């Protein structure tokens, strides 16, 4: 009965070493991802000061994207934004809007199917496998523009610090379908701008919102990848803590069993020798 506890000590010890390796590799990958994230945050600002920030629009069709992870040892990231995804789908919906639900990452199709099984329509995965580039976000945005909504909702985790990840909803309106209608306040706020494009302002807004969706999507899945790494860094730190607790209790148990083993094996020898002497 003392080789099962010994192999359990070996099991919990290699689990703890695996988990400390995972923690240190997530802490290294969080720092190399923080190079790319803080540079990509810049391009989000001109579109959010040019088009504003309008999350609760009365769109009759929206495409919602929950930016989830691929690997699953994050520790409650994808569940948190699935809660936020349905808590925005129960908020921005107003009149019977068609909502297309999309997920970026394998851990979104595992749970958005569990929440919105019928409105779920697209599943992007394997995106953080090599790296995240703007051509990749552009192709994903092209596949979202295959549908023609009046709004886009991007649900991602904004990497703030190494411990703080706030879920974020970033809204992109369709160019003259809803965006110009939300900018006119008795005249317009967009008619201050001298348009210097070739063709009409509807075409420059049609190009500009595709570019805004690609930028928002690229930054969203950079922020979510950095929060993924910094949340695996804390999930594999609590798991080393609990695998140290389990190992300490198992070592106390093993020493009790070792002492009891020596005592009973000695008492057998004394009882066998006292029957002869």
């Amino acid at each position: 009965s003392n080789q099962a506890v010994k192999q359990r000590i070996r099991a919990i010890k290699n689990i703890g070493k695996i988990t400390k390796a995972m923690k240190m590799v997530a802490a290294s990958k969080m720092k190399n991802a923080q190079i790319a994230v803080e540079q990509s945050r810049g391009l989000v600002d001109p579109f959010v000061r040019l088009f504003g920030d309008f999350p609760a629009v009365n769109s009759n069709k929206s495409v919602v994207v929950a930016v989830t992870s691929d690997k699953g040892l994050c520790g409650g990231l994808n569940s948190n934004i699935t809660k936020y995804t349905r808590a925005t789908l129960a908020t921005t919906e107003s009149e019977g809007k068609d909502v297309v639900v999309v997920s970026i990452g394998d851990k979104g199709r595992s749970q958005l199917t569990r929440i919105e099984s019928q409105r779920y329509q697209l599943a992007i995965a394997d995106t953080y496998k090599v790296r995240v580039t703007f051509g990749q976000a552009s192709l994903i945005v092209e596949e979202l523009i295959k549908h023609n909504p009046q709004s886009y909702q991007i649900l991602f985790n904004k990497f703030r610090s190494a411990i703080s990840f706030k879920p974020t909803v970033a809204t992109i309106l369709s160019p003259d379908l809803l965006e110009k209608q939300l900018e006119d306040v008795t005249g317009n706020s967009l008619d201050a701008y001298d348009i210097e494009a070739s063709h009409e302002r509807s075409d420059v807004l049609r190009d500009l919102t595709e570019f805004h969706l690609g930028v928002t999507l690229y930054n969203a899945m950079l922020e979510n990848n950095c929060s993924e790494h910094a949340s695996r860094m804390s999930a594999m730190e609590n798991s080393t803590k609990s695998a140290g607790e389990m190992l300490g209790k198992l070592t106390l148990d093993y020493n009790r069993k070792r002492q009891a083993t020596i005592t009973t094996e000695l008492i057998e020898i004394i009882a066998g020798a006292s029957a002869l002497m």
């Binding site: 945050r41 810049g42 609760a56 209608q181 006119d184 348009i195 494009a197 420059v204």
Partner: protein, 177 residues
């Protein structure tokens, strides 16, 4: 005219009544920006804030005294209190002037917003500077890109973008000092 009074402060007051009370309100990309567009000031004289961006870079976020942008109608220069503008940029050279020195950034296209408060937001995909360009592949690139034209309209568009980009690149790499 504005039949959906949207915004973050409306979403945070409507979101309290349709969501569970445990979840705090989601953040929005307006809370992570600082310089707005309509707001007063933000120029102070001969300099003006120029945010030259890229998806993978922030090339400049200082203040400049004039910005030459390669618009689709032609090269224009943004001075301090410029007219508000949403200029679509042709493949060309942005030069950020800050005195006598000029950084010659060849962009590959994009946009450039001059806002009412005088903030210039150049927004391009790739912005190579001119020294890291080779003049060898651009000439066979123009020769080959002026050759292959099938009945596809898609390759006509891609080939027109190719010839205008490489031709502007030769125009801005054979005319340097």
């Amino acid at each position: 005219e504005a039949a959906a009074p949207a915004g973050p402060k409306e979403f945070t007051e409507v979101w309290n009544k349709k969501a569970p009370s445990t979840l705090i309100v989601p953040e929005f990309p307006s809370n992570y920006t600082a310089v707005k567009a309509v707001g007063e000031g933000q120029v102070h004289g001969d300099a003006f804030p120029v945010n030259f961006y890229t998806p993978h870079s922030i090339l400049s976020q200082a203040q400049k005294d004039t910005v030459v942008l390669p618009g689709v109608d032609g090269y224009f220069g943004v001075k301090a209190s410029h007219v508000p503008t949403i200029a679509q940029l042709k493949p060309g050279v942005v030069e950020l002037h800050s005195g006598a020195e000029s950084e010659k950034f060849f962009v590959s296209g994009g946009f450039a917003f001059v806002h009412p408060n005088g903030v210039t937001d150049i927004c391009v995909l790739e912005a190579a500077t001119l020294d890291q360009v080779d003049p060898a592949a651009v000439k066979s690139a123009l020769a080959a890109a002026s050759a292959a034209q099938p009945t596809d309209e898609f390759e006509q568009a891609a080939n027109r973008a190719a010839i205008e980009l490489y031709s502007a690149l030769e125009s801005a790499v054979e005319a340097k000092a």
